[PDB]
Amino acid sequence: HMLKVMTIVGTRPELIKLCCVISEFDKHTKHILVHTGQNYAYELNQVFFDMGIRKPDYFLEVAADNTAKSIGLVIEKVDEVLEKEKPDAVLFYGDTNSCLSAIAAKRRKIPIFHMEAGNRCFDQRVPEEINRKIIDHISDVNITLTEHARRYLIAEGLPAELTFKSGSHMPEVLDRFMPKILKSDILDKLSLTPKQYFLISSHREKNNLKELLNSLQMLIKEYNFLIIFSTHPRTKKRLEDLEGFKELGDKIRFLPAFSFTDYVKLQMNAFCILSDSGTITEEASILNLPALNIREAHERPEGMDAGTLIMSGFKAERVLQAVKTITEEHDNNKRTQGLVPDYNEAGLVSKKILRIVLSYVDYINRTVWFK
Amino acid sequence: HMLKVMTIVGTRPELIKLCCVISEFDKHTKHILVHTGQNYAYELNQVFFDMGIRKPDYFLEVAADNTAKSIGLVIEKVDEVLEKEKPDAVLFYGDTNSCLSAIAAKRRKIPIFHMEAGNRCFDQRVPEEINRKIIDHISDVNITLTEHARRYLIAEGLPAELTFKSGSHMPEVLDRFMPKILKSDILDKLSLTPKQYFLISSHREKNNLKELLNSLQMLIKEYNFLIIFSTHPRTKKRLEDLEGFKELGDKIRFLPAFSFTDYVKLQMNAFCILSDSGTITEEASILNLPALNIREAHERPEGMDAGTLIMSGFKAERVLQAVKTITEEHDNNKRTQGLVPDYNEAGLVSKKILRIVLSYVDYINRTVWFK
Amino acid sequence: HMLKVMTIVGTRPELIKLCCVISEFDKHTKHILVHTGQNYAYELNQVFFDMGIRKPDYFLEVAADNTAKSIGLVIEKVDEVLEKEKPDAVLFYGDTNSCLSAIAAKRRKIPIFHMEAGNRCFDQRVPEEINRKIIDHISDVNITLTEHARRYLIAEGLPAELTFKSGSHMPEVLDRFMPKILKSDILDKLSLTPKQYFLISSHREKNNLKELLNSLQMLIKEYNFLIIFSTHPRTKKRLEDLEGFKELGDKIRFLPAFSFTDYVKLQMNAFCILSDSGTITEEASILNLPALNIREAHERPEGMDAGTLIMSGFKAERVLQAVKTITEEHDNNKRTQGLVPDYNEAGLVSKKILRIVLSYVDYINRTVWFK
Amino acid sequence: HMLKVMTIVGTRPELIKLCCVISEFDKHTKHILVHTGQNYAYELNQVFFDMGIRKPDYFLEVAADNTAKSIGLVIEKVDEVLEKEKPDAVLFYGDTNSCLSAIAAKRRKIPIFHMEAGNRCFDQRVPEEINRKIIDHISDVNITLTEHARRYLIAEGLPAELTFKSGSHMPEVLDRFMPKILKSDILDKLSLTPKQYFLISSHREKNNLKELLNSLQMLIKEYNFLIIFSTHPRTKKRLEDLEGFKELGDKIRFLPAFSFTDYVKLQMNAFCILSDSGTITEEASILNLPALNIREAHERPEGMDAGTLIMSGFKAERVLQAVKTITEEHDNNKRTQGLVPDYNEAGLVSKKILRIVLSYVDYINRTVWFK
Amino acid sequence: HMLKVMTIVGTRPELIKLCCVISEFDKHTKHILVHTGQNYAYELNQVFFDMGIRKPDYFLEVAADNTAKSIGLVIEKVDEVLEKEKPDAVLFYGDTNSCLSAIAAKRRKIPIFHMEAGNRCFDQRVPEEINRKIIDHISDVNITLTEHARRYLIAEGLPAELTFKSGSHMPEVLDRFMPKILKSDILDKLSLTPKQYFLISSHREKNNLKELLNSLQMLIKEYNFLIIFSTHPRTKKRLEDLEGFKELGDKIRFLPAFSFTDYVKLQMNAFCILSDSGTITEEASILNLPALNIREAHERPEGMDAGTLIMSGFKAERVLQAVKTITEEHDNNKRTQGLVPDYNEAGLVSKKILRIVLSYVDYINRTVWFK
């Protein structure tokens, strides 16, 4: 007789950060993988993800509109599948809207285990901050990437004995895919010279776009390297409609969606990366990448203890100073700073999460629910 | 030019605890009162509430099913009215499901003010505990009845400078309606003798019903007073289907829904009250009532500092000991214990909430949202 | 069927501070009163205590030697009576050695309720500090005289929801005995003039005795009032063997043990009191007494918020300055400072403790012991 | 002139965890080793311990009955030896009943240093929880195995500046004895095949025994490996009197007491270990053992950060799932998870404790006792 | 366009601990180095410091008198240079009087970054404790050598998100100068035999001098090794005027000021070091030195976790016991204890500080100053 575990996701970054966790749970539990979104969208993106991540057991068909209605629908639709499957435990990674379905799991007294817990940037303009607080304060067990995040949780009155530190999921994920990553021909497909392009990645939600474009312009004047720009369609157009977009010409190139493995190869060969991805601190630490976090607040203070990157924002003056500082003596193949102990020591996170789940389902059922 | 304030409710106890707040906001703001539930249900209950509480501006028609679907619908439906009205601030009282719509208000960067904040019973089997954490941790300003609740909030890392103590809303509400309460003829309508009946009130969510019935039986054997039982239809039937329900006979009487004012008159003349109402500690303190809280956990520790009541649970042995202890020397007209300073000193809460709202909308917009 | 409650004491100050608690528990529970000490000693002191405090059900005959052996004997002897009587709950007041028997009650999973909890002077030379920490950290419920003490307990990680504030026991005790106190003829028996004697009380555990004697000498030179000195035999002799003890002559008089009621009358008529009693802050606040605490650390910071007394120590320079400051404009019958809200508002503590016990035996048995 | 240090123990696990500490203190202080128990019992167990641990200077002859009387006797008897020897400091390891004698050391103002401090499982049914709180809150200096335990102590208001982290004592102890451990012929003496037996160890304090037996039965059906069962005589008999004990037959074998070194060899060659020993997390981490903690709460959360073991409880369903998960790919000689930094980095704990003692005796005497 | 950064120092130990930070900031910012003291004094000491530390841009000519007047002058004089240069950020290391000029920087809303933050010895007799609290509580960003210091800051209510851990500056500094250090001929210049001299260093602020001299005497009797004594002129004379100073004769030698590099060579070859330098714990850990901290309180608790040194004080009895314990088996070339992870893992601190500064100037200007 197996434990039934249900993992609930709604996005590709969740699936990537969970892929080893998913494998481990598939070996040792009756593991139900639930995607809150649309099967059609997932099959249209599956070429790009084709990593050996097996298909989810359910697609709940909630359009990820990021609306109050879509939030209500995730709660209602996840509830139906909880009623049907009656899992012994539920898993959530991070703080996308789909984590709000923890409300339904809690009302049913299903033990909840939350990974990448205790993210705090202390800027409530970041939309994920609403979800963060909610998911951390309703989960029975929280599992953090760092001591910083564990302390943040304890500081908000959460029980230390049910807060664990797994470390980053990314060392195990990267190690799994590194042979494929190294064999990627992405540089040949895009005709790129290693260390002679910028990789810019911006996927977050007017005055600010102009600032970004001016930063891009200034980087071209300064270094005369191509800029590879990875962003959402809505944002590509907005940029294109801007006055002096035509000045960039050959020095800017928008990247279509890429496979994870091609994309890491690209990262590993950039002159410098400018990213608003919530994964940049981990990626830059682990792979010794030259990197700017172009956000104005962030939730990975552990990087700053290590010297991992610079949080530049997206305006030209600080961006230029940051790029000079990072790139002047950087060799990805020589580690001089940026190693984060809580990432570096994470190891087989997949095994850790399963062992936590097995060790605490009964504990939670007794001490929380008095069953 | 007025501030536009939107107050969101879904139940009659919210409306009662807010009735003075509503009046004060009606005088001095553009005040929009939103009820998440069904207009039909509200008009069927309006005879019983007919207190001078003006009608809500909106009925959102979400059936209070207490389901995951109804929670999703409150979030979606409140969002529509936020989009339409664009209030400058939103108010929530307590922690019914309707408070979960604060999620929609937060996503829109509308300042949120929460009354009766920082309720904690530390038993997560109480369904309201899910809502409590959520509403307290997303609100920009929390307003508590007590120092105990203020400390609970600060202990969960919430900002002390945006946590206030109003005191109980009930002294102002009771004072408003006391002339009507005193003139109630409820004792004549039910042919009751003052101090010669039990008033039992149980409105919360099998083995336990039998225990309760045995408690009721034991109280009849011990005191031979009539029992007036106020409960939900679902629960009346369940009780009636029980074996030795027929033994109670003339000594038990189910009460139909009553007006607030009749009901307080009844409270004020009972030999002893047994209640699971979240308001019993306040009512019993303020009106010097002989009372048992029949729950197994509660969120009004301030009562225990004062000697207000006994939390007996619903089983006969502790119930009997508690009733003897409370009633043996109790005179409602002689105060010997049970006065709670944070209730007793609350005064005109209505005025306090408006002054807080006016004093902090701009502060929140600057310090939280950087507007 | 009654709850069986066992109250464990070893000293007269415990019995005095509990006398109303004892009465209330006698009315409503099967109340077993256990004295850890010697029946012979208790009957030799019973003239002086003859307050209507009924006799303890057990005398365990442990000599209060204040030795490691006597501590071991209290633990062993209390255990025997726990085995025999099997109480449903145990009560301890304060932090005498007898509270160390809570160890035996805990090992038997008997709910423990502790009054006058969270005393802290932050000077570990005070012997009671060992006992304080032990009793506060093993009790299931702590009951404090003040908010200060409640905060101290919460600050040491103890559960806020099982920490209550009763207020001082002394307003209820004094009110019970005030008619007898006012009718005392103690001033006539000792031929004293109201406001024309010092009352000095020192009952705690060489260089320091000389300092005290010099203080006494200096007070005689300054005011020429008689000194009434209440202390232990061991200490009377030590003083008498001192060089210039003969200089005091007629201006010092050692008091034999007195009845509580005579002793409060004496307090109420002193020019000024110098005391190391742990009750002086309460007594001086409640009865508006002119007072010095002659200790070097103390555990009643609430007094300092109110202006109750001065902690002078026992050396002449600070003692003299303190006496002038206190007595210059003091009238016991005119309140100008020194009223402590947490004392003043305590009311019928007896009723509070019983209501707490009834409300939390089951809670403790579930949440602590999982019974 | 040497510092006189007195180390107080009552059990074999204390002596084992202290054996290097004892050696280091013997070199550099006047070191008095006190055993609270019976010399006769110690000599009957000395064959099995014959590790080069020199004999204690005192046997106080308190029978380890685990009674309230034996606790009182440890306090009284340790006091006599404190009076006689007048040590400058006292050492305690862990939280056996003998640590309660710290009460006597404190009353004498002897600096107290406590190792393996800040153990918390948050289940007060575990008897050691009474002792834990007492010893941690009376010790002048606490020394922890982990950051988790240091944080638990700070969270209970204890002084951070007098709380240190030594790490686990076990790496140094194991390293000392590893040559003997590796040369053990225990497998030959018991005719065992490496990786083809379960080692079960249960030495803690009816319905639950039956559950355990069913777990044992299920493991035999599943794996058909011999079970080596190490337990107390009281428990061997209880098991034997059970109905279907006869079904196990040849597949269960009770182990007589063993030498430490033989026992670690056995651990290192088991297919899987099921243990309630408080040392299993350390042993399993350090030696890369396949292990279940069969308790229902535990005090080594650091293991869960690392992936060391599973806390299965003792019931068959969770036990079986846990055993499959642990053993499926486990090779003791290939480290894939379970390494705990605070254990792994501990090094020569013995040297650390002596350096702490020398560095803080004067500090404690000044800041605690004002000497 | 560069960021303008102003680093403010007043002493040689600041310059040494900053020398790599200074180089890194010189490469990547407009870096203004301000020395609050006298140019004349600096040029008289420059032979001894002649490390490739470029000359400060300003000497403010405040005599380091350690007076209330000199403190006022540092504040006034630093203000003038802030007005003139208008830096975008200011840097302070440690807690010398010159850090008090942070008051002027704060009043001008200049972001302040503080290194070696959160030093606490909990003995307010240490003069630096005044400065510590002031500088930590006014700085916008604090940067600590350890987790211990980070926790101390968080415990005083400071923002965790603006507190970072760089680790010790000393591994990078030592690594920079190790080739020169190893080539030093200091042993030949002083005719010393490796491991056959004591190095004593005492530079902090009568009864105590005599105690120290007796310690020195006792060490000569015990080991018959030469004592090299490094101290201030004021202190050399005081010692010399002491009675039995003449007994030491050939076995004591006062060292003139030395170059940093010669001095580390000397450290690395001493039999044992006795030091009150605030750097001894770092030096002794990193270089595996035999060492006593001769102070009575200290601020490097991380050492005690590792077994780095003994805090002996300066009196003979504890000093002798400490020296025996440290030196008996010590080989600088064999690491057996004393390695501190937060020091050992520090790496290129210089790079960390610059990355923090670039990452937080805008954050501070928004969230602190609302610019």
- ∠ CA B13-B19-B24, nearest 5°, is 150
Element (H, E) at D102: helix D102-107
Gap between the Cα atoms of D165 and D115, Å rounded:
9
Check CB contact under 8 Å for D122 and A3: no
Residue B306 with chain C: CB contacts under 8 Å: 352
C-alpha separations of B188 from A59, B223, B251, B266, D215 in Å: 62, 22, 18, 11, 67
List, in sequence order, every beta strand (DSSP E) within E180-322. 197-202, 226-231, 252-254, 272-275, 291-293, 310-311
Strand partners, A4: A30
Quick one: how far is CA D93 from the chain centroid? 9
Neighbour count for residue E243 (Cβ, 10 Å):
8
Contacts with C25 (C-beta within 8 Å, 6 or more apart), sequence order: C5, C7, C31, C91, C353, C354
The 3-state secondary structure of E51-73 reads CCCCCCCEECCCCCCCCHHHHHH
Which chains pack against B, by 3+ Cβ pairs within 8 A? A, C
The answer, yes or no, to whether D and B have at least 3 beta-carbon pairs within 8 Å is: no
Tokens of E77: 């004089």
Check CB contact under 8 Å for D75 and C68: yes
| Resolution, Å (one decimal) | 2.0
Residue among B28, B137, B148, B203 flagged as catalytic: B203
C-alpha separations of B175 from B261, B264, B285, B308, D350 in Å: 11, 12, 14, 20, 71
Which conformational region is residue D281 in: left (phi greater than 0), alpha (psi within -120 to 50 degrees), or beta?
A: alpha
Which of A64, A56, A55, A98 lies closest to A79 in space, CA to CA?
Answer: A98
Cα radius of gyration rounded to whole Å, chain C:
21
Of E305, E317, E320, the CB nearest to D165: E305
Which one is the CATH code of A1-185+343-371: 3.40.50.2000, 3.30.420.10, 3.40.50.300, 3.40.640.10?
3.40.50.2000
Pick the residue from chain A with its C-alpha nearest to E346: A306
Tokens of B230: 């106020």
Residue D138 with chain C: CB contacts under 8 Å: 130, 133-134
CATH H-level, domain B186-342: superfamily: Glycogen Phosphorylase B; (3.40.50.2000)
**At A144, is the secondary structure helix, strand, or coil?**
strand
DSSP letters spanning D27-52: HHSEEEEEE-S-HHHHHHTHHHH---
Neighbour count for residue C249 (Cβ, 10 Å):
8
C365 residue type, one letter: N
Residue among A148, A203, A232, A298 flagged as catalytic: A203
**Alpha-carbon distance A191 to nearest alpha carbon in chain B (angstroms):** 43
**At D141, is the secondary structure helix, strand, or coil?**
strand
Neighbour count for residue A70 (Cβ, 10 Å):
21
Gap between the Cα atoms of A197 and D329, Å rounded:
44
Contact between C92 and C8 (Cβ < 8 Å): yes
Of B71, B127, B157, the CB nearest to A155: B157
**Alpha-carbon distance D96 to nearest alpha carbon in chain A (angstroms):** 22
Of E27, E160, E347, the CB nearest to A151: E160
Cα radius of gyration rounded to whole Å, chain A:
21
Q: Do domains A1-185+343-371 and A186-342 have the same CATH topology?
A: yes
**Alpha-carbon distance D315 to nearest alpha carbon in chain A (angstroms):** 11
Residue E165 with chain A: CB contacts under 8 Å: 305
Catalytic sites of C, residue numbers: 203
Gap between the Cα atoms of D17 and D2, Å rounded:
24
Of D72, D134, D155, the CB nearest to C73: D72
- Number of residues that make up chain B: 371
Contact between B164 and B141 (Cβ < 8 Å): yes
Check CB contact under 8 Å for E161 and A324: no
**Domain extents for chain D?**
1-185+343-371, 186-342
**Alpha-carbon distance E71 to nearest alpha carbon in chain A (angstroms):** 32
Check CB contact under 8 Å for E154 and A152: no
The answer, yes or no, to whether E and C have at least 3 beta-carbon pairs within 8 Å is: no
Cα radius of gyration rounded to whole Å, chain E:
21
Tokens of B60: 């959102």
Give residue for tokens 């800040």. D118
List, in sequence order, every beta strand (DSSP E) within D4-151. 4-9, 30-35, 58-59, 89-93, 112-115, 141-144
Cα radius of gyration rounded to whole Å, chain B:
21
Check CB contact under 8 Å for A362 and D152: no
Mutate to test the interface with C, among B325, B329, B334, B345 (most CBs of C within 10 A): B325
**At D209, is the secondary structure helix, strand, or coil?**
helix
Residue C358 with chain B: CB contacts under 8 Å: 310-312, 318, 321-322, 325
Which conformational region is residue B157 in: left (phi greater than 0), alpha (psi within -120 to 50 degrees), or beta?
A: left
Give the technique used to solve this structure. X-ray
- Which stretches of chain B sit within 8 Å of chain C by CB? 120-122, 148, 151-152, 155, 293, 296-297, 301, 304-313, 317-318, 320-322, 324-325, 328, 336-337, 339, 341
Using CB atoms within 10 A of its CB, is residue A13 exposed (0-12), middle (13-18) or buried (19+)? middle
Residue E361 with chain A: CB contacts under 8 Å: 318
Residue E354 with chain A: CB contacts under 8 Å: 325
Tokens of E324: 């025996």
Tokens of B18: 């807010």
Of D161, D348, D358, the CB nearest to E310: D358
Give the residue ranges of DSSP H helices in chain B: 12-28, 39-44, 46-49, 68-85, 102-107, 128-138, 147-155, 170-183, 186-189, 207-223, 233-240, 260-269, 280-286, 302-306, 316-327, 341-344, 349-367
**At B144, is the secondary structure helix, strand, or coil?**
strand
Give residue for tokens 């409370």. B326
Pick the residue from chain B with its C-alpha nearest to C165: B305
Contact between A343 and A171 (Cβ < 8 Å): yes
Check CB contact under 8 Å for C79 and D67: yes
Handedness of CA A144, A146, A147, A149 (dihedral sign): negative
Gap between the Cα atoms of B234 and B203, Å rounded:
10
Tokens of B199: 């008033």
Check CB contact under 8 Å for C347 and B337: yes
Give residue for tokens 């005498």. C96
Which of B344, B322, B47, B331 lies closest to B171 in space, CA to CA?
Answer: B344
Residue B315's φ and ψ, nearest 5 degrees, are: -95, 150
Gap between the Cα atoms of E232 and E277, Å rounded:
13
Which of C330, C254, C256, C262 lies closest to C292 in space, CA to CA?
Answer: C330
A35 is catalytic: no
- Which stretches of chain A sit within 8 Å of chain D by CB? 1-3, 27-29, 154, 159-161, 164-166, 345, 347-348, 351-352, 354-356, 358-363, 366-367
Check CB contact under 8 Å for B311 and C2: no
Residue A100 with chain B: CB contacts under 8 Å: 103
Residue D341 with chain A: CB contacts under 8 Å: 345
Neighbour count for residue D251 (Cβ, 10 Å):
18
**Alpha-carbon distance B308 to nearest alpha carbon in chain C (angstroms):** 8
Tokens of C285: 């606040």
Which of D338, D234, D235, D346 lies closest to D292 in space, CA to CA?
Answer: D338
